[PDB]
Amino acid sequence: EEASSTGRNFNVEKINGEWHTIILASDKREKIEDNGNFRLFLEQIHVLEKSLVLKFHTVRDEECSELSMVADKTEKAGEYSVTYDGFNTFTIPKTDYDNFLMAHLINEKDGETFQLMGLYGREPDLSSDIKERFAQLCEEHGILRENIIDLSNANRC
Numbered sequence: 682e683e684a685s686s687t688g689r690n691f692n693v694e695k696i697n698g699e700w701h702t703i704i705l706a707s708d709k710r711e712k713i714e715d716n717g718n719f720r721l722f723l724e725q726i727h728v729l730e731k732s733l734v735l736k737f738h739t740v741r742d743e744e745c746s747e748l749s750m751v752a753d754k755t756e757k758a759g760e761y762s763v764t765y766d767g768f769n770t771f772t773i774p775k776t777d778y779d780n781f782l783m784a785h786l787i788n789e790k791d792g793e794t795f796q797l798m799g800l801y802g803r804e805p806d807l808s809s810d811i812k813e814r815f816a817q818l819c820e821e822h823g824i825l826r827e828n829i830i831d832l833s834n835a836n837r838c
C-alpha cells in the first residue's frame with residue numbers, strides 16, 4: 682500500500698527506521714551538487730509523538746561527518762519544519778513504507794526559496810522503476826531530470 686503524509690490514512694510510525702539517500706533533485710541544482718549544503722545522506726528516521734529525528738551524514742574531501750536534526754510537526758497534517766541553512770518545511774507525497782520514501786521540501790533563506798525533492802530507500806539503492814516514478818514526481822513539480830542526481834553510487838562512508 683502507498684500513502685502520502687498529508688493523506689488521511691498516513692501511518693507515520695511506519696516510516697521509522699533505516700533509510701538511505703538514493704536520489705536528490707532541486708530547482709537550484711547547486712544546493713545538491715558536490716559541496717552543496719543539501720547533499721545530505723540520510724541514515725535513519727526516528728518517529729516521535731510530534732517530531733522526527735533525522736540522522737544524516739555529509740561528505741567533503743572524501744570525509745564523512747554526522748549530523749542530526751529535529752523536524753517538528755506544523756499546523757498542517759503531514760508537514761514538518763526544521764531550521765537548517767534557512768527555514769525548511771517538508772511533506773512526504775508518496776511512500777510505500779517498505780521500499781521507498783519520496784519527500785518534497787521548500788527552503789527559504791535570505792528572502793529567497795527553492796524546492797528540494799528526495800528519494801530514499803530502505804536499502805542503499807532502489808529499482809529503476811521506482812527511480813522513474815520519482816522522476817515523474819519531480820516533473821510534476823517543475824524539476825527537470827537534468828536537475829535530478831542519483832547518489833546511489835556515493836551514499837556510503
Ligand SMILES: CCCCCCCO
Binds near residue numbers: 726733771798799
Ligand atoms: C523524512 C524525510 C526527510 C526530508 C528531506 C527532504 C527531501 O530531500
